[PDB]
Amino acid sequence: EKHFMVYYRAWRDKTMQGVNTTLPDENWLTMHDIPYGIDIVNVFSYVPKGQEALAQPFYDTLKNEYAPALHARGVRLVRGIDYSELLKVPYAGTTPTEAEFDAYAKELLTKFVDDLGIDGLDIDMETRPSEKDIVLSNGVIRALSKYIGPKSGTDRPFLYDTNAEYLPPLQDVSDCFDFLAYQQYGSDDKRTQRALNNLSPVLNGERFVPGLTFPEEQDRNRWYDTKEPYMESNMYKVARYSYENNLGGMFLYALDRDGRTYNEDDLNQIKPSNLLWTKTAIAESKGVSLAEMKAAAQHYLKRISYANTDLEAQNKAAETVTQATTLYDVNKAILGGDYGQGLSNTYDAELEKGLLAIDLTTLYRALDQAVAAIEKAESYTPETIQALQTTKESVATELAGKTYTAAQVTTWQTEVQTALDNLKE
Ligand SMILES: CC(=O)N[C@@H]1[C@@H](O)[C@H](O[C@@H]2O[C@H](CO[C@H]3O[C@H](CO[C@H]4O[C@H](CO)[C@@H](O)[C@H](O)[C@@H]4O)[C@@H](O)[C@H](O[C@H]4O[C@H](CO)[C@@H](O)[C@H](O)[C@@H]4O)[C@@H]3O)[C@@H](O)[C@H](O[C@H]3O[C@H](CO)[C@@H](O)[C@H](O)[C@@H]3O)[C@@H]2O)[C@@H](CO)O[C@H]1O
């Protein structure tokens, strides 16, 4: 049971503009674009004071569109809150009672979770809080565990993310979280096992999810978790270590920045991304075999060949997939190094895996006969070849889309086959 999480920077969704940035660039992705295979999304949102109205459209879309759509895909969502939030528990006396802890836990869940249609919570603790703070945080976390996390009896996640191994705020309430999200941006599996060992008294490796980042625009820090050769990048090392040592999985920060750099062009720009590194990391963490990856890649290349006019690029991609030695290479053969540089910008290995179950052989032979008829176009009547061409191009465009169903494939088979049976001469 592996997890793959992502911290979705809310202010980089299309529904936001001018929130938490000074860059006039338009955002390029929505939450619909989050790749398949990610089972936990952390709606990570920070709104500078005075911009709440600008971020409200995103929250509305999240509650009414993104969250239902991602729930339909089996994805659970969590909200990222500061650890200090837990410290704001109201109480009358010198220390909060059990009832006051419960009241503030329900308050947090209504404020940050239920009011957005989201499932769970994520506590971002990058501090060294004192014993006084930890009393309150322990009370609040234990109260929350009644409604979210393992001790709640529900599917709702309760996560604890940190970049260090300060145990005091975690040792007394460790069993209330589904897993700990360890941020190790710019570090490989050595820091991973170092932190695992330092967290051993309070956390088992199976509930330890290491995570890396992509370069954030205008960032003062410099975390290099991507690089070629792929097998020398921190992403490969951490993913393969997580799979090999049966860790809880892996997470990534700033999904929108997949494939970006700190170069002056990327540092001050918002650009689209083929999400190559994210999908590769999902596969590497899950332990996908190279045969599986190649099969999915070839299925995708076959179902887009009817709509793609670049036969040379098709041949090159197919050959590279066959000659690929790593999952990264199989994904890059289709996606390319960067957005637009590939035969496709949206190929998703997990989505394609889901599609594998649908048989396309009938549709494929029908489309091949249609292509043969279009090749001998001068030999039929135009009034009928034009029906065939319109139907074939429409079916090929639809077949190369993001997803399809068995019923749609049946309809397309019927349409192409009718168009074929109606050719004159
Ligand atoms: C999990 C993780 O990856 N954590 C951090 C990353 O956040 C951090 O990236 C940067 O994050 C800031 C946003 O961080 C602030 O808000 C976080 C989310 O909580 C907010 O919303 C909650 C719910 O409404 C509120 O309860 C909360 O108060 C807050 O408003 C919050 O978790 C975070 O707090 C952590 O860090 C502080 C110290 O800074 C610590 O005291 C806390 O205890 C806690 O651990 C912050 O309060 C985001 O604004 C940054 O993005 C800008 O800058 C980048 C360039 O760096 C631009 O690309 C981008 O366009 C924005 O202009 C950035 O994403 C990374 C380091 O970058 O480190 C991780 O560990």
Residue numbers in the entry: 61 to 485
Sentences from the paper on this structure:
Here we focus on EndoE, a multi-modular glycoside hydrolase secreted by Enterococcus faecalis, one of the leading causes of healthcare-associated infections. We provide X-ray crystal structures of EndoE, which show an architecture composed of four domains, including GH18 and GH20 glycoside hydrolases connected by two consecutive three α-helical bundles. We determine that the GH20 domain is an exo-β-1,2-N-acetylglucosaminidase, whereas the GH18 domain is an endo-β-1,4-N-acetylglucosaminidase that exclusively processes the central core of complex-type or high-mannose-type N-glycans. Both glycoside hydrolase domains act in a concerted manner to process diverse N-glycans on glycoproteins, including therapeutic IgG antibodies.
EndoE-GH18L-Man5 crystallized in the C 1 2 1 space group with two molecules in the asymmetric unit and diffracted to a maximum resolution of 2.6 Å. The structural comparison of EndoE-GH18L and the product bound EndoE-GH18L-Man5 revealed that the protein structure is mostly preserved upon glycan binding and that there are no substantial conformational changes (r.m.s.d. of 0.58 Å for 416 residues). The Man5 product could be modelled unambiguously in the electron density map, located at the center of the (β/α)8-barrel and surrounded by the loops 1 to 8. The GlcNAc (-1) residue adopts a chair conformation (4C1) in which O1 makes hydrogen bonds with the side chains of E186 and Q243, and O3 establishes an intramolecular hydrogen bond with the cyclic oxygen atom in the Man (-2) ring. The N2 atom of the acetamide group interacts through hydrogen bonds with the side chains of D184 and E186, whereas the O7 atom makes a hydrogen bond with the side chain of Y245. This conformation likely corresponds to a stage of the catalytic cycle of the enzyme shortly before the release of the glycan product. The crystal structure of the EndoE-GH18L-Man5 complex reveals that the Man5 glycan is accommodated in a groove that forms a narrow space for the α(1,3) antenna. Specifically, loop 1 of the GH18 domain clearly restricts the access of additional Man residues with respect to Man (-6). In that sense, our crystal structure of the EndoE-GH18L-Man5 complex unveils the molecular mechanism of HM-type N-glycan substrate recognition and specificity of EndoE. Supporting this notion, the crystal structure of the EndoE-GH18L-Man5 complex and docking calculations of EndoE-GH18L with Man6, Man7, and Man9 show that Man6 can bind to the active site of the GH18 domain because the additional mannose (Man (-7)) of the α(1,3) antenna can interact with loop 1 of the enzyme.
